[PDB]
Amino acid sequence: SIRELEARIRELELRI
Amino acid sequence: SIRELEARIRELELRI
């Protein structure tokens, strides 16, 4: 679960 | 803790 959350934050960061 | 983090990312995603 933690690896999917990490992936979601990375993209948000990337986008933002 | 993981369920609260999931909720926080979902909203960010939603907003963004």
Next chain:
Amino acid sequence: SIRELEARIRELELRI
């Protein structure tokens, strides 16, 4: 790992 993710979301929130 969860504490680093928490920190990353807090900043995103802060920024956003």
